[PDB]
Design an enzyme around this catalytic site. Structure first.
Site, short mmCIF file in Angstrom:
data_model
loop_
_atom_site.label_atom_id
_atom_site.label_comp_id
_atom_site.label_asym_id
_atom_site.label_seq_id
_atom_site.Cartn_x
_atom_site.Cartn_y
_atom_site.Cartn_z
N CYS A 139 0.80 -1.22 0.00
CA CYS A 139 0.00 0.00 0.00
C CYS A 139 0.83 1.26 0.00
O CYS A 139 1.55 1.55 0.97
CB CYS A 139 -0.96 0.02 1.20
SG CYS A 139 -1.88 1.59 1.44
N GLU A 167 -4.86 4.58 -10.61
CA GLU A 167 -5.70 3.41 -10.45
C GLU A 167 -6.79 3.50 -11.49
O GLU A 167 -7.22 2.49 -12.06
CB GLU A 167 -6.29 3.36 -9.05
CG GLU A 167 -5.28 3.13 -7.93
CD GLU A 167 -5.95 3.05 -6.56
OE1 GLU A 167 -6.56 2.00 -6.27
OE2 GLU A 167 -5.86 4.03 -5.80
N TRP A 169 -8.87 6.89 -0.32
CA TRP A 169 -9.17 7.63 -1.52
C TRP A 169 -8.22 7.18 -2.64
O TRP A 169 -7.28 6.42 -2.40
CB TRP A 169 -9.09 9.14 -1.28
CG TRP A 169 -7.79 9.60 -0.67
CD1 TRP A 169 -6.59 9.75 -1.31
CD2 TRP A 169 -7.57 9.98 0.70
NE1 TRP A 169 -5.63 10.20 -0.42
CE2 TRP A 169 -6.21 10.34 0.82
CE3 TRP A 169 -8.39 10.04 1.83
CZ2 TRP A 169 -5.65 10.76 2.03
CZ3 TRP A 169 -7.83 10.46 3.04
CH2 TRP A 169 -6.48 10.82 3.12
N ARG A 173 0.41 4.46 3.06
CA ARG A 173 0.45 4.12 4.48
C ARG A 173 0.86 5.25 5.43
O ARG A 173 0.83 5.07 6.65
CB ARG A 173 1.33 2.90 4.71
CG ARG A 173 0.62 1.60 4.54
CD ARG A 173 1.57 0.48 4.76
NE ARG A 173 2.50 0.34 3.65
CZ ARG A 173 3.62 -0.37 3.72
NH1 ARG A 173 3.90 -1.00 4.86
NH2 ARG A 173 4.43 -0.47 2.66
#
Ligand code: HEM
Ligand code: HEM
Ligand SMILES: CN(C)c1ccc(CCNCc2ccc3ccc(N)nc3c2)cc1
Ligand SMILES: CN(C)c1ccc(CCNCc2ccc3ccc(N)nc3c2)cc1
Ligand SMILES: C[C@H](O)[C@H](O)[C@H]1CNc2nc(N)[nH]c(=O)c2N1
Ligand SMILES: C[C@H](O)[C@H](O)[C@H]1CNc2nc(N)[nH]c(=O)c2N1
Ligand SMILES: [Zn+2]
Lengths: 408, 413
Positions: free
Chosen positions: B111, B288, B283, B114
Site C-alpha cells: 500500500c 488506479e 481515496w 500508508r
C-alpha cells in the site's frame, strides 16, 4: 514441486520445472523477499562446477554419456588435477557465452540469445592487444548502423593477481565533470572514472558529450589509456518529428550499448573481462540516461520548451515531457538507420520468448523488477506477466570496480 | 537470519537499516533459490494454536501504549487465556481492535498510502446479526467516508469467524463497483472485471439496467446465512464525470468513475482472530483509474479510442501513440476529481510521501515492509522516487489477507 506463472491479461499459465536445476542463492528467504535489492576457487571447488557445466554441455548436444563426454570429463579432471584450472574448448566457450545471456534474469532482449558473435581473445597478453580486440569488436558490432550482438572474451582469472579488466563501465560512455559551482557537466554517473582517466593523463575536452577513452588492464598490470578511433563511434543527434526546437537542446547519444564491467562465469572459470554489446531499448536512453535525477536530468528543460504548466505535480507535466523525449530518441535512431527497439515491441518479444523457453526448456528466469520498462509499465504485456526468478549457470555476474582492489 | 539488513536509495544515496524483519510471521513464498515477488498470490483455529497468537498481539499492544509488563498487561493476558480455555476464542477490547486495524494497514506492504495509517476511523460492527444490519453499517460507512468529497479513510469491522460455518462476508470486492455483462456475441458491456459477480447478482434476483456504469447492489452474508441483495442509496454514491482541461471532445467519451475506493473482500487478522468482513476505504491514486481501470486491455480499454480522437499515428508502435494517450487520460482523471473537489492523489505526490513515510518508519520502528512491484505506479515508474528505492518485503501481523471468493465455499441453506 512444479510452479505456475500466470499472465493476467491473457490468462496463459506456464509451468516451471527449470527452477529445480539451480543451486546459487537468490538472496531471499522464506520470510524476507529482496526482489528490489540490486545486489543481495580451489581444485576441490573447481571440478564439480567443471563437471556440471560439461555435463549440461554434452546434454545440450544430445551426446550425454558418450565417449566424447567421458574422455572430456577425464581430460578436464586430469587438467585441474595438474594445473589447478582448465581451458574451455572453443565449442564450450561459445555455448557458455550464449547460455550466460540466455540465463540473464534481467535482460528483456533474450529472444536474441542464440545469435551472438563470440570473439575469443584468450590469447591476449597486453592492453595494446586488448585495445586491438576491442576495436575489432566495436567495428563489427556497429556494422554501419545495423548492429549485431557480440562478445569479446579475454583470459580467465588465474590467481586473482593477474586479471584482465576493462575499467570503463561501457566501451562507449560519456565523460562527466564536477564543475566549480558544484554542478556536473556531462554524465554524472561517470564522474569518478572520468577523473581517474584525467589523473592518468587524459586531456578532456570538457563538453557535454565527450567520448571517454579506453582504460585497459592486462594480466593484473596497471591500466593503459587508448582513444577509440572516432570513425568507429556511431553517434545519433536527437531531434523530434513535430517539435522543430528539439535539436536546439543539443542532444545526442551513441548507437552501441556495450557493457564492459561484468564477470562471465563458465564451468567454474572466471572471465573478469568480457565486454559484450547488443542494441538499445529506447527507454534506456529516453527515460533513464536522459531523465533520471542523477543522470542528464533534462525533464524540466524539455517541459519548458513545451511551455507546460509546471506549478503542480498533478498536471503530469513530467509525464508529458517524458513521452515526447522518448519519441524523439526512437525517431532519431530510426531516421539514422541505427538499430533500436521501443519498449512495446521489446516486451512483446520477451513474452513470446518466455513461451518458447517454457515449451522447450521448462522455464525462464526473469526479473520482473528489471523486465518491466521504466515508463508506461502496465500498457506493456510484461507488467501483467507473473515471472519466477532464479539463478542458472553459466551467467553474467557483477564485480568490484577495479580501482577498489588494484595496487599500482 | 541476519539481524541488520540495509536498503539503499540509488537516487539520493540514503541508506537505511532494517531490524523489524526479524519479527516476520508468515512465509512470503520466496525461498533461498527462487523469488516469487511478481506472483500475485503465492475450518478454524484451535485452542493450543490461539494462545501464542493472542499473547503475541497483546504483548505488542501493551508495548505500543508503554505499559509493558504492567498489572493491566498481565491481567489482560490472564483474562484472554481463561477465555480461550473456556470458549475456545476471545474478544478484543475496543482499544485493541482499533490498534489492530490501524496496524494491519500499517503492515500492508503493498500500500503506497500508508503515511495516513494512523488516521483511520474505525467502526465497530461486532453487534451485527443480520444482512439488513450489515447494510445499515455499510451505508453509514459510505456517508462518513465520502463526506461530500472530502474523503476520510475508514473501516467497518463485523463479527469474527467462529467455527467457519457462521462467517460474515461481503460478496462485493469493492462496496462500490460497476457491473459487467457478457454479451452473446463475445463483447462485454461495462467492466470486464466484475462480470462474474454481476452474473451472481442477477441470479440472486437483481434486475440489471445493463449499461456501462451501473452501480452493483450489495451482496451481504451475515452469520453464515445465504447472502441478500440491497441497493445502496444513489445519493450516497459520489461519482465524477471525466473531462479534460484542453480537449473539449473528451467529455463526449461518456466516462465517469466513483469517488470512493472501498475494498470489501479482504480478511483482517488480529491476534489470531479472523474478521472475514472488514470493508475499508481510503481515496484514489489517479493511476488506479487512468491507467488500470481505464487502459488495461482486460478492463475498460479506452486507449485506442482516445488515440483515435487525438488523431495519433497508430500504425507503428514506436510513435508511442499509446504512451501519449495514457498521459492525457491520466491528466483528465486528476483534473476532474480536483474540479469536483473530490479527494484524489497523483502518483508523484503519493510516491514522494511514501518515501518520507518509509524513512520515518525505519527511524521510529526499525523498518517498513514494502512491495516494490506494487508500490511503483503503473506509469512513469522511474520518474517517481520509489523506483530508485530499495525495499524489503515481509509479512507482519496484524494484517489484511486475501480469502477465497465466498460463492466458491458457501454451503447454501
Ligand atoms: C540484442 C539486443 C539487446 C537488448 C534489446 C537488450 C535489452 C536489455 C535491457 C533494456 C536491459 C536493462 C539494463 C538496464 O536497464 O540497465 C538489459 C540487461 C542485461 N542484458 Fe540485455 N539486451 C540486449 C543484448 C544483450 C547481450 C548481447 C547480452 C550478453 C551477451 C545481454 C545481457 C544482459 C545482462 C547480463 C543484463 C543485466 C544488466 C545488469 O545486470 O546490470 N543483453 N538488456
Ligand atoms: C488513504 C488513501 C490510500 C491510498 C492513496 C492508497 C493507495 C493504495 C494503492 C494505489 C494501492 C494499490 C491497489 C491496487 O493497485 O489494486 C493500495 C493497496 C492496498 N491498500 Fe492502500 N491506499 C489508501 C488507503 C488504505 C486503507 C485505509 C487501507 C486499510 C485500512 C489500505 C490497505 C491496503 C491494502 C491491504 C492494499 C493491498 C491491495 C491488495 O492486496 O489488493 N489502504 N493502496
Ligand atoms: C552497481 N549498480 C548499482 C548498478 C549495476 C548495474 C546497472 C545497470 C547496468 N547494466 C546496463 C546494461 C547492461 C546490458 C545491456 C545490454 C543491452 C542493452 N541494450 N542495454 C544494456 C544495459 C546499474 C547500476
Ligand atoms: C485475485 N486477483 C488476481 C487480484 C487481487 C487483487 C488485486 C488488486 C486489488 N487491490 C485493490 C485495492 C485495495 C486497497 C486499496 C486501498 C486504497 C485505494 N485507493 N485502492 C485500493 C485498491 C487485483 C487482482
Ligand atoms: C531499487 C531498484 O531495484 C532499482 O532502482 C532498479 C529497479 N529496476 C530497474 N530495472 C532496470 N531495467 N534497470 C535498472 O537499473 C533498475 N533499477
Ligand atoms: C504480474 C504482476 O505481479 C501483477 O501484474 C501486479 C504487478 N504490480 C501491481 N501493482 C499494483 N499496484 N497493482 C497491481 O494490480 C499490480 N499487478
Ligand atoms: Zn523474493
Amino acid at each position: 514441486r512444479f510452479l505456475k506463472v500466470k499472465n493476467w491479461e491473457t490468462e496463459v499459465v506456464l509451468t516451471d520445472t527449470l527452477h529445480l536445476k539451480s543451486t546459487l542463492e537468490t538472496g531471499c528467504t522464506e520470510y524476507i523477499c529482496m526482489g528490489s535489492i540490486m545486489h543481495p576457487a580451489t581444485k576441490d571447488q573447481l571440478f564439480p562446477l567443471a563437471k556440471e557445466f560439461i555435463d549440461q554441455y554434452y546434454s545440450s548436444i544430445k551426446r550425454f554419456g558418450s565417449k566424447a563426454h567421458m574422455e572430456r570429463l577425464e581430460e578436464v579432471n586430469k587438467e585441474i588435477d595438474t594445473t589447478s584450472t582448465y581451458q574451455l574448448k572453443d565449442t564450450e566457450l561459445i555455448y557458455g557465452a550464449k547460455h550466460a545471456w540466455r540465463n540473464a534474469s534481467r535482460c528483456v532482449g533474450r529472444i536474441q540469445w542464440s545469435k551472438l558473435q563470440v570473439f575469443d581473445a584468450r590469447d591476449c597478453t597486453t592492453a595494446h592487444g586488448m585495445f586491438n580486440y576491442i576495436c575489432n569488436h566495436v567495428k563489427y558490432a556497429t556494422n554501419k548502423g545495423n548492429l549485431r550482438s557480440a562478445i569479446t572474451i579475454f583470459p580467465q582469472r588465474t590467481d586473482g593477481k593477474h586479471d584482465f579488466r576493462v575499467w570503463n563501465s561501457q566501451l562507449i560512455r560519456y565523460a562527466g565533470y564536477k564543475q566549480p559551482d558544484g554542478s556536473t557537466l556531462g554524465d554524472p554517473a561517470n564522474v569518478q572514472f572520468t577523473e581517474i582517466c584525467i589523473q592518468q593523463g587524459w586531456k578532456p575536452p570538457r563538453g557535454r558529450f565527450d567520448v571517454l577513452p579506453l582504460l585497459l588492464q592486462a594480466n593484473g598490470n596497471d591500466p593503459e589509456l587508448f582513444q577509440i578511433p572516432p570513425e568507429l563511434v556511431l553517434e545519433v543527434p536527437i531531434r523530434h518529428p513535430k517539435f522543430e526546437w528539439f535539436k536546439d537542446l543539443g542532444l545526442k547519444w551513441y548507437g552501441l550499448p556495450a557493457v564492459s564491467n561484468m564477470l562471465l562465469e563458465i564451468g567454474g572459470l572466471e572471465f573478469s573481462a568480457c565486454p559484450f554489446s547488443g542494441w538499445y531499448m529506447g527507454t534506456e536512453i529516453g527515460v533513464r540516461d536522459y531523465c533520471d535525477n542523477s543522470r542528464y536530468n533534462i525533464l524540466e528543460e524539455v517541459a519548458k520548451k513545451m511551455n507546460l504548466d509546471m506549478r503542480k505535480t498533478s498536471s503530469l507535466w513530467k509525464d508529458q515531457a517524458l513521452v515526447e523525449i522518448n519519441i524523439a530518441v526512437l525517431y532519431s535512431f530510426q531516421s539514422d538507420k541505427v538499430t533500436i527497439v521501443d519498449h512495446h515491441s521489446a516486451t512483446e518479444s520477451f513474452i513470446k520468448h518466455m513461451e518458447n523457453e517454457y515449451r522447450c526448456r521448462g522455464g525462464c528466469p526473469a526479473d520482473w523488477v528489471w523486465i518491466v520498462p521504466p515508463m508506461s509499465g502496465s500498457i506493456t504485456p510484461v507488467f501483467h506477466q507473473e515471472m519466477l526468478n532464479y539463478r542458472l549457470t553459466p551467467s553474467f555476474e557483477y564485480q568490484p570496480d577495479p580501482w577498489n582492489t588494484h595496487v599500482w
